[PDB]
Write a protein that binds this ligand. Sequence first.
Ligand SMILES: Cc1cc2nc3c(=O)[nH]c(=O)nc-3n(C[C@H](O)[C@H](O)[C@H](O)COP(=O)(O)OP(=O)(O)OC[C@H]3O[C@@H](n4cnc5c(N)ncnc54)[C@H](O)[C@@H]3O)c2cc1C
Length: 403
Amino acid sequence: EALKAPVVVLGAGLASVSFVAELRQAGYQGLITVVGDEAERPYDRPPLSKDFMAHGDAEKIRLDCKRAPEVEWLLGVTAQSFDPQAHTVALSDGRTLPYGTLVLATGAAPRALPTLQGATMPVHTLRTLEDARRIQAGLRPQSRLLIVGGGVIGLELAATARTAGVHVSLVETQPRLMSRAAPATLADFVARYHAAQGVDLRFERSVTGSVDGVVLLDDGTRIAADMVVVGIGVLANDALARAAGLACDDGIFVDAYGRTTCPDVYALGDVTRQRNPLSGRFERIETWSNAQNQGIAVARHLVDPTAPGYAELPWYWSDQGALRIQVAGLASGDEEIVRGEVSLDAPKFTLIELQKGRIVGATCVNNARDFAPLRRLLAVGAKPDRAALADPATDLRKLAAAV
Ligand SMILES: Cc1cc2nc3c(=O)[nH]c(=O)nc-3n(C[C@H](O)[C@H](O)[C@H](O)COP(=O)(O)OP(=O)(O)OC[C@H]3O[C@@H](n4cnc5c(N)ncnc54)[C@H](O)[C@@H]3O)c2cc1C
């Protein structure tokens, strides 16, 4: 009933690929056309601040579109508008696509830093393969890089650059790193780690401008750099939705079925503002797992309306040099349990966040084995013995089973 052919998807990132693969796997055999503005074989973004940045082979980062047969991918073309009454999309190449169902999977773009508008030195953001190539082409040993923003992508780049012999400074307006989505205990540890690897961290500082290759700060000081990479967050690519009259606020509002306020128009991935089931609040979730899992859930329910809505709880990972970080659920509750020592010597530890005895979040550093059982405990809102949670004798995989 809701799934009317033909299907058109705007954007050819992970959310789009995941969605169209699930349509096909679920048994939808009608037309699917995907419009992607980048002239690139669909690819995954996490490598761009990690192994790609370090090794440079794009053929290792392409998405597998095998599970999406009989899809026409229009690469290198921009959707300029859609008409939700006429059920058409206008493309940059002069063509128009009809749709029965339109899916907005247009992701998000890095925020620009207003104070570096009109800079006369290299200032880049890191979102695309083209961006990664441009940054890498300036990543010369003994170069000086300034990163603005202490989010995970900036820190991943910082680690990659330090490994490459680049001098790295980093300016963060907040008193801590990773202020968006990380427990304070983790953020404090991560700052200690980056400082130990030679990153020059500047907290509670903002950029006020730049002159002749030097960046100015609001403490009245200067940082010289060969290159600036801005990583102060992203803004949803929701321009077509806004123009067409959908409800948007730095992100397209969707329910758990991916429905927008416009009939026959859905949205998924980084472009969406959606319910976080742990907080009960709407948020723009900016994670790989959301893009994949939301795409799959929305596709499944389109093909099979008896399927449940999207219900997965949020999580991400970050690879920052020697730290393999995994974070699930909420950054804080009324209680944190620490498993292991938090030490720069062979870092390995787990954090558990509880709210009235209930697990609401978890972090693992170099401890992948414990993250899977903790996510299962989180998912059912488990209330385990806090003594056992702390006790390292406890096997978390066993708790997961017991529940
Ligand atoms: C460098 C980097 C590292 C990351 N590392 C991690 C990590 O370690 N862990 C993690 O959990 N997440 C990570 N992420 C986040 C994750 O990659 C994103 O959540 C994911 O890419 C979102 O996918 P999406 O399909 O919703 O959006 P996107 O990947 O942004 O895809 C949307 C596509 O639509 C295109 N588009 C926009 N407007 C139009 C239009 N009008 N017409 C046609 N096409 C259009 C965009 O240009 C883009 O190609 C990282 C992201 C980056 C950039």
